Amino acid sequence: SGAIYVGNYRVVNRHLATHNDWANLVWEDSSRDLLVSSTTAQGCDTIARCDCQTGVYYCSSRRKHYPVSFSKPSLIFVEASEYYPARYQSHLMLAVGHSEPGDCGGILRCQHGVVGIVSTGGNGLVGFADVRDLLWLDEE
Ligand SMILES: O=C1C=C[C@@H](OC(F)F)C=N1
Numbered sequence: 001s002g003a004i005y006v007g008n009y010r011v012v013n014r015h016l017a018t019h020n021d022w023a024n025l026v027w028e029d030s031s032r033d034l035l036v037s038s039t040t041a042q043g044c045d046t047i048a049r050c051d052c053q054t055g056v057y058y059c060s061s062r063r064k065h066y067p068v069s070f071s072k073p074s075l076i077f078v079e080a081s082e083y084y085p086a087r088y089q090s091h092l093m094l095a096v097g098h099s100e101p102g103d104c105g106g107i108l109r110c111q112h113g114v115v116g117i118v119s120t121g122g123n124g125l126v127g128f129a130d131v132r133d134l135l136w137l138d139e140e
């Protein structure tokens with residue numbers, strides 16, 4: 001589990017969105033595994049605006065933050081998980097690291113701020129849904 005809180009937006013894995021998220025929907029994209037809902041209180045997070053390929057992510061299944069190198073966001077085939085069938089997921093970054101389903105929502109951060117959230121795992125990789133292209137998160 002986990003979210004990004006930027007301005008009056010809450011960014012979650014689409015597959016973990018709640019009824020309240022869907023009832024306060026701003027934007028969602030199944031292909032990206034992302035959903036954004038509106039918040040009453042302003043959030044503590046700054047979104048990275050950059051093309052970094054190195055950062056640190058939080059792994060809840062290890063209670064640990066790991067430094068990683070990661071691929072640039074791309075359209076990637078993802079094997080079946082507990083929460084999606086095998087499918088193509090867009091805007092996905094991969095790193096070598098540990099990820100189980102419940103690790104989804106852990107933040108990946110670089111020197112510029114929040115890069116994305118854990119969205120995929122298995123076979124020794126961790127996949128992160130990028131948010132750095134979502135410039136509208138920074139305003140309004
Ligand atoms: O509705 C879902 C939830 C999990 C899933 O995975 C599959 F392989 F079980 C697929 N779709």
Ligand SMILES: [Zn+2]
Binds near residue numbers: 048051052110
């Ligand atoms: Zn960066």
